[PDB]
């Protein structure tokens, strides 16, 4: 059953194994991290007890630092409240498409995706339906395993992501993931 060993050879270490794992992880973290209520026995975010490597830990702080700030924006937060909910499968695919509809197949929009889904994950957590939570994470790994996979693989894994968040005045980063995602919410429908 040994075959020949464990982990043969294949140019490009950061294969999909280390990626797919960091896919259901990172998210699974930022999720039960900011929404992880204290004294709440029986967490709806069942999957991984805790992150082993600290590689994700640090990357997790980035989602918490920006989340606390971005989540403090009455603008973006309001827009998400103006986008009625009647089909998370249609809109999700719609908005996710608008993100990089012509931009430049960059990748930054990705980060915004995690935040955009967060609302659907946490928002549905209150509706009293933990099923949607698991159904959501599915749309992520699916898109990431059907897309970012190729690109992310050429970016050196999720490392390229953290490597990008290493510039000066971050005020430019928040204006990017927002100016791109926000726009999607602007076109979708402008009602108030």
């Amino acid at each position: 059953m040994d075959g020949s060993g464990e982990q043969p050879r294949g140019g490009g270490p950061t294969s999909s194994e280390q990626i797919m794992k960091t896919g259901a992880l990172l998210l699974q973290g930022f999720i039960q991290d900011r929404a992880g209520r204290m004294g709440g026995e029986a967490p709806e975010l069942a999957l991984d007890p805790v992150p082993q490597d600290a590689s994700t830990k640090k990357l997790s702080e980035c989602l918490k630092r920006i989340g606390d700030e971005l989540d403090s924006n009455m603008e973006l937060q309001r827009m998400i409240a103006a986008v009625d909910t009647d089909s998370p499968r249609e809109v999700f695919f719609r908005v996710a498409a608008d993100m990089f509809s012509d931009g430049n197949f960059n990748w930054g929009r990705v980060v915004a995706l995690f935040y955009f889904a967060s609302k659907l994950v946490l928002k549905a957590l209150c509706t009293k339906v933990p099923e949607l939570i698991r159904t959501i994470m599915g749309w992520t790994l699916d898109f990431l395993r059907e897309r970012l996979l190729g690109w992310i693989q050429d970016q050196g894994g999720w490392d390229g992501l953290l490597s990008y968040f290493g510039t000066p005045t971050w005020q430019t980063v928040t204006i990017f993931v927002a100016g791109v995602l926000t726009a999607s919410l602007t076109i979708w429908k402008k009602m108030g």
Partner: peptide, 21 residues
């Protein structure tokens, strides 16, 4: 910062929709 003043009847109805799907 609190209370959305828009999630009471909007939701209660969002789910109801139809009795016994």
């Amino acid at each position: 910062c609190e209370a959305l003043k828009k999630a009471l009847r909007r939701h209660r109805f969002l789910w109801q929709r139809r009795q016994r799907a």
